[PDB]
Amino acid sequence: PSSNTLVEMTLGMKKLKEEMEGVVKELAENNHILERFGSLTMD
Amino acid sequence: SSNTLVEMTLGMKKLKEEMEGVVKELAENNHILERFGSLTM
Amino acid sequence: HPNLDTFTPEELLQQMKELLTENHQLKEAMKLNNQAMKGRFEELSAWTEKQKEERQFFEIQSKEAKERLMALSH
Amino acid sequence: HPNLDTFTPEELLQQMKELLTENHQLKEAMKLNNQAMKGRFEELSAWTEKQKEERQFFEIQSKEAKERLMALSH
């Protein structure tokens, strides 16, 4: 609850949110490729 | 700091356990991908 | 802007709640992806076996036909 | 003294640094994992295509051999 603690926690928490934005886009891409896997043995 | 350090502790602990769970699923995914390479050979 | 750009304890807690939710949803989605990838794998294995078997049927038909021909052009 | 199952401020910051480390690790692993997904998808595409082409080759070979057999049977 000290200033320094809250500043450092804030920085960290904002960084975690940023990284997860990146992660979920990675997952989105994973989902897309997986969807395409189901079409390899078709036509 | 009363029950805000209490509350923050529990929050941080749960987050850590959940991220650990994600790593295990990713590990399984990577294992399945290795076997996919095996399929073509 | 140190006062504005610094979270209160209550906002930090809120953020922790939100990251937990995002991570849980991430975990559960990856479980589903692994299940589906295992399905795609069995499907592709079954399919390649079917293809090999059909290829062989045709190699055999072709060889028999090439032979029946010779065994009469004579 | 602080209670055992409750983080001190110092411990809370330590735990935050560990989460950053782990999360960063996860992100890089995910990038690697998606590169692998794409690499496998490319390999499986090529592989399934090869098997279709090889089935089709023998199917055409068989078909033409049988046609030849019938026309030259007379």
Author numbering:
A (entry chain C): 678 to 720
B (entry chain D): 679 to 719
C (entry chain A), D (entry chain B): 29 to 102
Lines quoted from the article behind this entry:
OPTN is an ubiquitin-binding autophagy receptor, which is initially found to participate in the xenophagy and aggrephagy processes, and more recently is also demonstrated to involve in the PARKIN-dependent mitophagy. The N-terminal coiled-coil region of OPTN is responsible for its interaction with TANK-binding kinase 1 (TBK1), which is a noncanonical IκB kinase family member involved in innate immunity and autophagy. Here we biochemically and structurally characterize the interaction between OPTN and TBK1, and demonstrate that the direct association of OPTN N-terminal coiled-coil domain (NTD) with TBK1 CTD domain is responsible for the OPTN/TBK1 complex formation. The structures of OPTN NTD in complex with TBK1 CTD and the related NAP1/TBK1 complex solved in this study not only elucidate the detailed molecular mechanism underlying the OPTN and TBK1 interaction but also uncover a general interaction mode governing TBK1's binding to all of its currently identified binding adaptor proteins.
